[PDB]
């Protein structure tokens with residue numbers, strides 16, 4: 001599969017050994033053939049596991065998840081999906097890799113969709129080879145794939161709020177459970193309910209993943225409450241998955257604002273990945289998968305696909321050519337290639353609002369396309385009254401860089417900036433001119 005002009009989809013079931021068995025073999029072949037290679041990890045936890053499986057081989061780790069001394073003789077680079085897309089957007093020159101390997105190639109974050117589109121366009125052009133590793137490739141309709149050991153699948157009503165009665169099967173369990181919830185706020189309520197009942201609970205989310213995931217290997221626990229971030233390679237020594245089968249979906253209303261719609265059904269790929277956390281030990285059959293709803297294709301019209309088109313329109317490919325999205329996922333957005341292409345100064349602002357500002361892609365695009373400079377924060381305060389960000393049922397207030405107290409009322413409203421305490425705290429600092 002290491003011949004140019006070819007994209008291979010390695011669709012082995014979860015736990016088949018794509019990362020620890022197949023990946024080192026591919027890397028050995030690539031090094032033997034002198035192919036300049038990139039290995040793309042979804043998260044820093046998967047990058048650290050990749051280092052363990054590739055230990056010894058000459059790989060340059062362009063991540064702070066690994067403390068390795070690079071010898072300067074490596075032709076294989078390893079970085080996160082976001083780092084690849086980030087360096088492509090920045091004026092830093094990215095080598096034209098002969099071989100592009102993406103682990104967990106089902107990841108639906110905007111930068112992972114943009115990386116797949118850039119890589120597949122290069123392959124379509126006959127300029128490179130690529131391998132996409134995932135049990136659930138884009139376009140999968142099977143939520144119950146094969147596993148290392150048999151799994152008990154059980155359709156049951158799963159609590160999405162705290163409960164006093166009616167769900168004995170949840171707490172009358174003597175093993176370890178991984179519970180997928182649609183949001184951090186929903187996870188907090190369920191975790192507080194389990195803690196009140198004498199349970200040891202760890203909570204995981206996109207922002208707190210690195211610190212808290214370490215606790216799953218450092219201490220004993222009864223439950224892990226996680227958002228969909230644990231679908232991307234996170235391993236646990238658990239015997240049960242409780243899956244709400246629900247997710248939050250960012251949606252752009254009338255091209256003017258972003259809302260977090262739902263909770264709504266997960267896609268089949270997400271349900272298969274969530275179920276995939278268990279049934280991984282062939283010596284421990286009978287791990288349980290309790291699911292609380294059905295699947296639907298909620299990736300259609302999801303903002304991440306539009307956001308990925310905003311990223312690719314501002315990545316240089318060849319003269320005025322623009323990368324297309326990877327074909328099985330190109331129908332998820334009604335978009336024209338090049339419609340989000342920005343001029344040089346606005347594009348520089350767009351990059352900075354994402355890289356330094358930490359704003360969602362859609363919100364960074366609104367600000368940059370309006371001709372506003374990175375450091376100009378007047379837009380955080382001059383929106384309509386219906387854009388007032390609320391904190392505990394009362395308007396959120398910040399001290400501006402001018403020393404005044406103002407109501408946070410952004411010109412463009414993106415629900416992701418105030419979806420939880422940590423997101424709102426970060427957006428208040430941005431509005432205050434603190435970064």
Ligand SMILES: Cn1cc(C(F)(F)F)nc1[C@@H]1CCCNC1
Nearest residue numbers: 376377378379381400401402404
């Ligand atoms: C010029 N400027 C910019 C901002 C911001 F912080 F909201 F962006 N506030 C101001 C006020 C306007 C009224 C007099 N005090 C300064």
